[PDB]
Amino acid sequence: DNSRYTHFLTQHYDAKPQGRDDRYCESIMRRRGLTSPCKDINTFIHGNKRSIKAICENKNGNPHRENLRISKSSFQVTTCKLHGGSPWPPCQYRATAGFRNIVVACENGLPVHLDQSIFR
């Protein structure tokens, strides 16, 4: 019911990250259980949760493509991209810190999906 929103938070939300370098990515990807198999790309959104939720309303969002929403405001983000040939741990990640608007899918006014294509 709210399980998708809570899984969005686990996969894509980190309120106040510690130094957004490769070691941040390798650590947080483990902590969030995204390392079996190694997820190929994943982006974390920083700042407060309320700004992300607001994308689902007209406050901080517009409709986008087929049933996505795109934010009006820009977010501090960090993209972890897997390096090395192997799908399996240890999972080495290159971090790319970014600042831009983001694309989500909303369900019941909650974000339940992050569109990763924009960070590739």
Residue numbers in the entry: 2 to 121
Please give me the paper's original passages concerning this structure.
In the native ANG structure F100 and V103 residues (located on β5 and β6 strands respectively) are in close proximity to the substrate binding site involving residue E108. The results from two variant structures F100I and V103I are analyzed here and both the variant residues are well defined in their respective electron density maps. On the other hand, in the V103I ALS variant structure, the side chain seems to have gained additional interactions with residues I46, I56 and F76 making the hydrophobic core more stable. This provides some structural explanation for the altered catalytic activity for this variant.
Angiogenin (ANG), a 14-kDa basic protein is an angiogenic ribonuclease and member of the bovine pancreatic ribonuclease (RNase A) family (also known as RNase 5). Like RNase A, ANG cleaves preferentially on the 3′ side of pyrimidines and follows a transphosphorylation/hydrolysis mechanism. In addition, the crystal structure of human ANG has revealed that it has an RNase A fold and the catalytic triad (residues H13, K40 and H114) is conserved. The enzymatic activity of ANG is several orders of magnitude lower than that of RNase A towards conventional RNase substrates, but essential for its angiogenic effect.
